[PDB]
């Protein structure tokens, strides 16, 4: 086509989606990770994760307001990945890298799994 | 913080939100523009437009499944702007620029209004 493109548009959209999440506006699901609860938008979770994409395209699970993750999932690892979904920024540290990588593998977030693998390989 | 950032994340999220829109997945509103209907995600509309942000933060309108726009709004101008919201690409042409600018002013999409003003000024 002959379209013009606004370079900062995608980043501005994601910034506003994170502002809606912070104010709990139009969040339509609670993700339960052991004792911890995380409110989010189903569409953003699907757009970032192969696991959530599979869950919310399922004809019965698409209507659930609560999703319980596997008990082996670490709430801090999930929190870090949820923040990444809404910001593009990943808080990867020596103390959390193993939990973040395991959570990203479970959530099917291949770019996160890739950077975790590279950061671990460098420390070996 | 000491975060790492994935450059293509925001663009990848927006691409997936557009794929969900194209397959009519988890769309929660229909925007009526005279005889034409457009399905969308309330969160994306709010993230792109000052008008939709005001509408869906309203305690009564947040729950409506149908929103009717002002009869002066051109359906093609709306379609072009809805496509821009989901892609960052604006199909701006001599034949549609006046309708696109008027629709962007109504929707409160200041970056679109700005480029329309500059493109019109250049043709004068």
């Amino acid at each position: 086509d002959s379209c013009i493109q606004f370079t900062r548009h995608a980043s501005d959209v994601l910034l506003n989606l994170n502002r809606l999440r912070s104010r709990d506006i139009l969040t339509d699901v609670v993700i339960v990770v052991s004792r911890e609860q995380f409110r989010a938008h189903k569409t953003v979770l699907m757009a970032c994760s192969g696991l959530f994409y599979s869950i919310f395209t399922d004809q019965l699970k698409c209507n659930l307001s609560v999703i319980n993750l596997d008990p082996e999932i670490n709430p801090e690892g999930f929190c870090i990945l949820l923040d990444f979904m809404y910001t593009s920024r990943l808080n990867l540290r020596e103390g959390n890298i193993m939990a973040v990588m395991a959570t990203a593998m479970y959530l099917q977030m291949e770019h996160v799994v890739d950077t975790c693998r590279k950061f671990i390989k460098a420390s070996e | 913080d000491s975060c790492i950032q994935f450059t293509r994340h925001a663009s990848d999220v927006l691409l997936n939100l557009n794929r969900l829109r194209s397959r009519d997945i988890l769309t929660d509103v229909v925007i009526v523009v005279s005889r034409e209907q457009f399905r969308a995600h309330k969160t994306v509309l709010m993230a792109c437009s000052g008008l939709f942000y005001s509408i869906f933060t309203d305690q009564l309108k947040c729950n409506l499944s149908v929103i009717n726009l002002d009869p002066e709004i051109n359906p093609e101008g709306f379609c072009i702007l809805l496509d821009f919201m989901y892609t960052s690409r604006l199909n701006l042409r001599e034949g549609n620029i006046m309708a696109v600018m008027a629709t962007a002013m109504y929707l409160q999409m200041e970056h679109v209004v700005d480029t329309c003003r500059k493109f019109i000024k250049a043709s004068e």
């Binding site: 379209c3 013009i4 493109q5 606004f6 370079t7 | 690409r89 970056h111 480029t115």
Partner: peptide, 4 residues
């Protein structure tokens, strides 16, 4: 704005 750019030419993509």
């Amino acid at each position: 704005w750019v030419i993509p």
